[model samples]
Target chain A: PIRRGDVYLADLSPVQGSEQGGVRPVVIIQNDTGNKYSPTVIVAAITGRINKAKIPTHVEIEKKKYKLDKDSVILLEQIRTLDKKRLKEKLTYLSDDKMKEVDNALMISLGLNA
Target chain B: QDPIRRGDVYLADLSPVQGSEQGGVRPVVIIQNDTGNKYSPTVIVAAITGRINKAKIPTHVEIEKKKYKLDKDSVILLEQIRTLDKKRLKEKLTYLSDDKMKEVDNALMISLGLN
Candidate 1:
C-alpha cells in the first residue's frame, strides 16, 4: 500500500493548462490514514531543476540517499491529487529528516503552520 | 504600514513565475496566521482573480465584490497558493468577512486533503 513520504513514478499526462504533465517522480504527501483508505493520494512533483531562490515551499532531496539518479526538488506549489491507477513503481521512502523538511514545506505551501 | 493579518487582501507582484504558476500584479488574500504574518518575512497567500468559471471547483472560494472592495466578484484560487516575501505585498485592499474566510478554510482543507 502507498504511504506518506514514498516516492513513486506517476503518469500526469493530458495537460490542460500549466500543470506539470508526463511521467515523472512524485512524493506522496497525503497523510497515512488517507493513503490507506482513499482511492486518491496527494503528491508533490519532484524535478531535477534546482530552484535558485530555494524558496521555503521547495524542498531539496539528496539523490544518493534515496538511490535516485539525480538530486531533485519537491515542488510544493505543484501539488496534485490523483487516482491510485496513476501511480507506477515505488522508488524509495524519504528519511524522517527529509520528511520533516517536506512537512515544513507543506505547512508553508498550505499555510497550515500559520 | 499596518501589520499584516490573516484575511487581509493586498495587491502583490507575483512576478518571475515558472510553469503553471500565477504571476503579475494581482490581489491576494493573506492566509498565514497572525503570528507568522507579523514575525515572518514571508507570508502565505491565495491568489484572487476575476476570471475562472466560478463555483464549479471545490478548491476555489468566491468573494463578493462589494463586501471585499474588489471591482468584480472574485474567486480565491487555493491551488495557486504560494509563500511570498512581505515586500511583494502592496496596497491594502480590503479584508474578508469571517464567514468568507471560513469558506476559504474549508476550501483549503478540501484542496490539501486535510480532512
Candidate 2:
C-alpha cells in the first residue's frame, strides 16, 4: 500500500505542449486516507536543481538525506495529482522532519498560510 | 526606490541554486498586499514561464503579450508562488490590467479552494 511521504518515479509522458512533461521523480504529498481511497494522489515534482538559499516554496534535499542518488529540489509550485498507475518503483521516503518541511512548503505555495 | 505593488512584474535574481526551478535570473510578478510590501522585507511573487499549454489544469493565469513587459505570452503560475526578499526584485516590468488582476484573484480563490 502507498503511504504518505512515499517517493516514486512517475511517467508523465505524452505531455501536452508547455506542460511539465516526461518521466520524473515525485514525492507523494497526499494523506494516507487519500492514497488508499483515491485512484489519484497529489504529488510534487522533484527537480535535480539545488536551490541557492532557503526558500519558503522549496525544500532542498541531499542524496544521503533521502537515499537519493543525486541531490534534488522539491518543487512546491509543481503540485498536481496523478493516477496510481502512473507511479513506478519506490525510490525512498521523506523523513518525518522533512515531511513537515514539505507540509509548510505546500501551505505557503498554496497560499494557505499567507 | 521604486514602490513595488501588486500586479507589477520584475526580473529577480533567482540564482545561487543548482537544482531549483528556473534557477537563474527570471521574471516574476508581485502578488501580495501593498501594506505588506511596505512594511515587510519580503514580498510574494509567482514565477512566469513561457510554456503555455491550455490542457495543463490546476489554475494558471495567462498574461497576454503587449499587456506586460514580457513581450511574449507568459503565465502567472499560481502553484509556484514564493516569498522573496524585496531586494530580489531587480527590474520593473509592467502591470496587469484591473480585469486581469481580478481574474488572477479568482484563479487564486479556486486554486486555494476558497471558491
Candidate 3:
C-alpha cells in the first residue's frame, strides 16, 4: 500500500491545458488518515526540468535522495487528487527535515493564510 | 545571522509527511510580515510551478521567464501557501523585485477570495 510522502510515478495522462500533463512522478501529499479511508490521494506533480527558482513554494529533488534515477522538480501548484490506482512504484520517503519544507510549501499552495 | 526577511527566497527542507506534512528540498518564498519574520519562529509562503498555461487561473499569478530566472514562464499558485518553522529554511536564493512582489500580493488576495 502507498503511504503519505511516498514518491511514485503517477499516470497523469490526458490532462487539461497547462496542467502537469502526461504520466510523471508525484509526491503523495495527502495525510495518512485521509489516504487510508479515501480511494483518492492528493499529490503534487513532479517535473524533470529545473528552471523555476527563488519562488517560495517550489521544491527540487535530488535523484539519490528520493531514489529517482534523475533529479526532478516538485510543482506545488499542480497538486491534484486522483484514484489510488494512479500511484505506481514506491520510491522512497522524504527525510524529517525535507518533509517540513513540503508542509510549509503546501500551506502556501493551499492558502493557510487565506 | 540575519533574521528571516520578507520577499526573500530560501531553500527549505520539506519532508516526512506523517504529521509534519510533506517531504523534499524545494525553494520557498517567505511571505509573512517582517514582524513575524523577526519575532515568530514560523513563516508563511507559497509554492511556484514552471508549467504555464495560456488560460488564466484566478488563484495563480503569471511570472515572466527571463526576468525571474526561471526555465519557462511560471505561475505562482497562491492556494498552496503554508506555514513552517524558520529552521526548515536552508539557504538564500534570489529576491523578488518590487513589481513582482505586487503581483504576488494581488494574487494572494484573489486566492483568498478577497479580490
Candidate 4:
C-alpha cells in the first residue's frame, strides 16, 4: 500500500507549458488515511537535476540514504494530486528526520505559517 | 497604479522561472485577501491557463470564458500559486464574481489540506 514518505516513480506525461513531464520520482505527501481510501495521492516532484539556490521549499535527498543512483531534490512548488495509475515502482521510504524536513518544506511552500 | 484587490485578474510577467515553474506573460487571479492586497507590495495569485485538462485535479478551479472577459476558458492552477510583486502586473483584465470567488476559496482549502 502507498504511504506517506514513500518514494515512487510516476509518469507525469502530457504536460502543458511549464508543467513537469516525463517519468520522474515523487514522494507521497498525502496522509495514510487518505491514501487508503482515495483513488489519487498527492506528491511532490523529485529531480536529480539539482538547483543550487538555497530555497526553503526544496528538500535534498541523499542518494546513499535512499539507495538511489543520484542525489535528488524534492520540488515542493511542483506538487500535484495524481491517480494511482501514474505511480510505478516504489523506490524507498524517507527517514523520519527527512520526512520532518519535507514537512517543513511543505509548510513553506503552502505558506501555512504565513 | 490601480488599487489591487482580491478576485481581480491581471496579466503578469512571470519571467526567469526555474524548472516546472510557469513563465512568460500569463493571466493570474489574485487570491490574497483584500487586507493583504491593500497593504502588501506582493500579492498571492493562482496562475491561470487555457489548459482545461488541469481542471481534472481537485485543486484546479475552472473559470468561464467571456463571463470573466477572458478570451477562452481558463483553469486556475492552484498548485502553481505564487506571490508576485505588484510591479509584475501589466493590467487588470477582470474580476471574478462572488460565487466564483467562493469556488476559489473551496479549491484553495482543498489544495492546502484545510478541508
Candidate 5:
C-alpha cells in the first residue's frame, strides 16, 4: 500500500512508441494525472539524447565527485514544444507559488538539492 | 527580492491546441513575476513517444537476451504513493533533513517496487 506518504518512480506511455530508434524524456506527473496528459513534470536524464530518455541506472546517487553534471543532471521537464503555448493558457488556476513548488519538486527529485 | 520565491509560478488562459495537441496535453508555464505581472515564455512542448499504462497490469515480456515486466499491484500502489509524494516533497524542500530526504527518495523507489 502507498499508505499516506511515499514516493515513486514510474514509466508511463502517453502514446505508442516508435519502432525506429526514438527516445523520449521521462516526464513526471505529480499529484494528479487528470488531463489525460496531466504531465506535472518531465525528467531529463543527463545521459540520454536531447529528446529520448529512460529509467535511471541505479537507486544510489553516484558520488558527485565522480559524476559529471552534463550527463547526470536532472531538470524539471516542464514546457515541451506543445505544452509551451498551452501552459500559457492555464496560468490562472494555480498560484505563482504553486507553479514554482512544482518546479522545486522536480529539482529535488532529480538528485539536485537546489 | 523575487516575491516569486521557489514554487511560485502560474499559468494563463489559452485558446486550446490546434492539432495532435489534444489527448494527454499540457499548457504553457505561466510564471507570475514579483511585480505581480504575468509572463508566458514562447515555447512548444512534446510528449515522449510510448504507451503509458497507469496502474499497468502486472506482466513480463522476454526477448532473446532481455526481459521486461511490470507488477500491476505495484503500479497502482506506486500511483497512490506518488500522490503522497507530492506533499512529502514539499515537506522535504521545506524542512526534511538530509537523511530524511534520502528516506523520501527511497520511498519513491519503493513505489517503483524497488528493493
Candidate 6:
C-alpha cells in the first residue's frame, strides 16, 4: 500500500537518509526499453501496461515466489493450449467451437471436468 | 499482502453438467500482488475452460451441488493489460490489443530470476 504523494521519478537518484522517513519499497520498471516510463502506481492500472522497476532507485530486486493455485495451474494449462493453437497457420482466429474445445481441454487438464 | 488463494469453485472441480444458467459462475480473480513495480497489481482471471475434470481429481475438492455443461467455453476472461515498449504502454487498455496478446504467447526469454 504505497501512500499517496510518495512516488517520485525513478529516473532520478535517491537522497541520503531518505529511508529515515519510512518510504515504502517502490518497484520501478523500464518496460521494453531504456527510456519508457510507466504511469504512477495509481494511474498505471488505468493504463494497463505492467512495467518493471526496482525500489530505492538502485537497490537489488529480490524476486518473489509464485505459488500456483489450482486456478493459476489451470491458467498455465490454458496458456499451453493457446500456444499450441498458434502453431497452426491454417487456424484463423480461434473459432467458437475451437475456443469451446480449448476450454474443455483446460478443465480436463485441471481435473475439473470429470 | 497475501497472494491469491484457491476457491471452493475451482477446488470443487465442478464442471457444467446438463444445463443451467452460469452467469459469471467462476468470476475473474485479479490478483494485485505485484505491489511495487509498474505492473504491481497483475490482473489475471481464473477460468474452467473446455471439458470438466473428474470429480475425484481436485484432491481436496468437494461440492454440495452442481450445474452447467462440461464442454462449454467456461473460461474466465481475465482482464489483463500487458506492458509493451515505452511508446505503446498506454494508460488505458482496450479490447483490440490482440497483437500484443499474441506476443504474450510468442515470448520465451531466459529466466532472469523467476517471474
Best by DockQ: 1
Q: Pick the candidate with the highest lDDT.
A: 1
Task: List model 5 lDDT by residue over B1-115, tens digit each.
Answer: 2222212112222222233333322111111121221111221111111234443322111111111121211111112211111111111111223453354444333322222
Question: Which digits, one per residue and each the tens of the lDDT, describe model 2 over residues A1-114?
Answer: 887788999875543323344788888876565567656666777888654777677898888867776888987656555668888998889888988888777665544443
- Model 6 accuracy (lDDT, Cα): 0.21
iRMS of each prediction: 8.5, 10.9, 13.2, 8.4, 13.7, 19.0
For model 6 the local lDDT of residue B79 reads 16
Candidate 3 Cα outliers beyond 4 Å, as residue runs = B1-115
Please, what are the lDDT tens digits per residue for candidate 6 over residues B19-85? 2212223322221112321322222222233335543221111121223223343332221111111
**TM-score for the second chain in candidate 5?**
0.22
Candidate closer to the true structure by TM-score (higher is better), 1 or 3: 1
Each model's TM-score? 0.59, 0.50, 0.49, 0.56, 0.22, 0.20
Per-candidate Cα lDDT values, in order, are: 0.77, 0.68, 0.65, 0.75, 0.25, 0.21
Score residue B104 of candidate 4 by CA lDDT.
Answer: 80
Q: Candidate 4 at A60: error in angstroms?
A: 0.5
Report the C-alpha lDDT of model 3 over B1-115, residue by residue, as the tens digit. 3477777777776553322222356666777666556765566666666764577765567777777666577676555555556677777766778787777877655443232
Tell me which of candidates 1 and 2 scores higher on TM-score: 1
Candidate 4 local Cα displacement, residue B7, angstroms:
7.2
- Model 6: per-residue Cα lDDT over A7-46, one tens digit each: 1212111211211112122221112221122121210110
Residue B74 of candidate 5: its Cα lDDT?
14
After superposing candidate 2, which stretches have Cα over 4 Å from the reference?
A16-18, B1-115
Q: Per-residue lDDT for B1-115 in model 1, tens only? A: 3399989999998765544556689999988767667766667788888955545877788887877778898899776666666877889998998888888987776666554
All DockQ scores? 0.12, 0.05, 0.03, 0.06, 0.05, 0.03
